Design a protein around this nucleic acid. Structure first.
Ligand code: ZN
Ligand code: ZN
Ligand code: ZN
Ligand code: ZN
Lengths: 199, 203, 203, 200
DNA sequence: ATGGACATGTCCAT
DNA sequence: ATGGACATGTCCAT
DNA sequence: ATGGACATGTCCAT
DNA sequence: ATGGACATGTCCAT
């Protein structure tokens, strides 16, 4: 289907807000988020956490879906999926139940449920809203990406962007944040290059 | 106990003094392909046409054929079979409009009688062709090989050094000749070759 | 009342049967102009008098006139206004001794009542001339046109082809008909013409 | 409207040697010089390198001036201007703050001055001496050729040679060096103009 | 005024 | 870049 | 073709 | 987990 995913930032009546724990002057860790460019840099397959704040508590049945999209209008249609090589590839595959096919996995929550919607094809990952445990904390999820942005036959260097959706108990959406991302072996030397290069 | 189909590296000049020689190449960096006689590495590019001068003093027995088969140069990889990275295999490109099996890595551009052998005892891929007399040309007789995966492809070769093996055979399958060399499918064979010739030219 | 932004193309003979007959073409190889009814497109050389017969089944409404406006053949380039290449426009040649604007491409050679218009809304350059009835033992009204830049000119047509629109209209402008055709201001129409028919008569 | 310019070849105090990039066998690069015919063939609007040498070093105010001239006697007086079409076309000007009517442009040195004699008319491009690479390369420059020798309204295909005058601070010439040139759409071809030389 | 040869430029694959 | 087919206009003789 | 810049990733000593 | 050299392919202009 020539269906294209919705990507506007929905605050949420609950002012659903997505943010990144801040890096205190770090160079080349596993990941890094640049507010400077509103795109994060997570080295492939490595874990990566994204924090979640809100305004008012979300009804029961509430979950959130991390979904990937190619940013440039060319391949916006073309769905984001794992490159032939990796998908197939014995490592980070064997033993691991999470579909070999997808790009976004949720190492951490076992209940975290994937999806491969037949209607569109746009596969993804979900888990229901866990309130922060100790009080006015922020629910955080562990994500990890199974293919660099460079992966050929895969994303294929095409700049992708992520759409995290706070959703109903059914499928409806009450708020969603997005941002670009890029899988680099050395995220950082890349962000550093990015900023410095332009402004 | 008899028929061993694990490839045989060391080369056998044979009873017709088998010799696999080259033609000069566009020493220019981007050259489709280029040979480094010294380092004895053939530098060819993906799917681009690479020729290989082959001759013998006396003529080979009716039925004679030629086989080119890929073998990982490193021994910790020797075991592994050289199959075009599943990436390309599954690629719809370079495969459509071809009789040549995309599963394979080495192809023969030009010979209508090209037979792509796929060993069912060892699982070794390769390509065989009838021997072909050098009609009016200098002794050299040429085969036109193509390489469908960069030695740098992932899943597949994965930067692993491959060493090519050209064999001389009887319909019997029996071997009369054999010669070999290191190959590296890349972009910029020139660059790459110079590079290597100066690590050695260095020490 | 000349309301269509982009010049109106598709044919309309109208009430008074409107027909644009092409005089017997100087078949000759380097003819000033020669007309291929085949490709229903003609070839005048540059500025050499090019006539065109014009027939009509009944008498046209007093004050009616004929309009010749040049328009590019394909949309890829259609929005542009067929203005003379600035070389010629700015020319010192065929600039002087002209009632017609160096800017204009088409001129009515010989009508002491010729008229060049420049649509202040669209930017259309054309040339209107009052209708005048066919006369002695003839049913054709004849107007002789001129073309001030061959397709090869740079500042203007840069090899891009165009269609001519002989419009038939009320003084207020309202059209009573129109006929068109591809034109190529060349040198060597006889040649050019056959060549076109030939690079096509096969497939 | 005026008298011609200084046409001869002047070596000068400092043996001001003008020369080209020697070639490996090239068939159609952007340009090429034919020693047999003392003329160059740059493709229109293309990059074109002129190599220079001297002997002793030139004073400070030293500049180098590139100027075009018609070779054909009859035409000679005439101003080597840019073709009408080209001058003012969809074709580039904005990217070239450089005059849109002067034929020889200097793609590179952002100090190069394009002048038009108010007396003669002669448009020409100037830039001060740039000592080698302080290395050996002997200060080569970059020339760009707005219009073909074919483009009309302009050169209207009449042979031209371009004198390069190394000049003083004031305006004196210490070294002049000329040679014919032909902005061909494929310099590859005038390889056979030299063929038509030994055509006999 | 006429047709053919040449002159110069554009488009194209590797 | 690097030749090779063709687009197009001009010169030269008839 | 062609070479030069450069995009993105692997290998390392700490 | 940090900074650095290099491996490799692609892009761009030529
Ligand atoms: Zn991948
Ligand atoms: Zn591959
Ligand atoms: Zn014109
Ligand atoms: Zn011009």
């Amino acid at each position: 289907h020539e269906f294209i995913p919705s990507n506007t930032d929905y605050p949420g009546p609950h002012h659903f807000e997505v943010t990144f724990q801040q890096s205190s002057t770090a160079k080349s860790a596993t990941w890094t988020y640049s507010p400077l460019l509103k795109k994060l840099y997570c080295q492939i397959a490595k874990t990566c956490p994204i924090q979640i704040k809100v305004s008012t508590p979300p009804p029961p049945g509430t979950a959130i879906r991390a979904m990937p999209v190619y940013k440039k209008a060319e391949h916006v249609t073309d769905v984001v999926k794992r490159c032939p090589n990796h998908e197939l590839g014995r490592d980070f595959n064997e033993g691991q139940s999470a579909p070999a096919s997808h790009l976004i996995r949720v190492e951490g929550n076992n209940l975290s449920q994937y999806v491969d919607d037949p209607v569109t094809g746009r596969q993804s990952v979900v888990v229901p809203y866990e309130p922060p445990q100790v009080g006015t904390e922020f629910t955080t999820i562990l994500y990890n990406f199974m293919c660099n942005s460079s992966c050929v036959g895969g994303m294929n260097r095409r700049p992708i962007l992520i759409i995290i959706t706070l959703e109903m108990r059914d499928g409806q959406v009450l708020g969603r944040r997005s941002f670009e991302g890029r899988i680099c072996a050395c995220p950082g030397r890349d962000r550093k290059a990015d900023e410095d290069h332009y402004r």
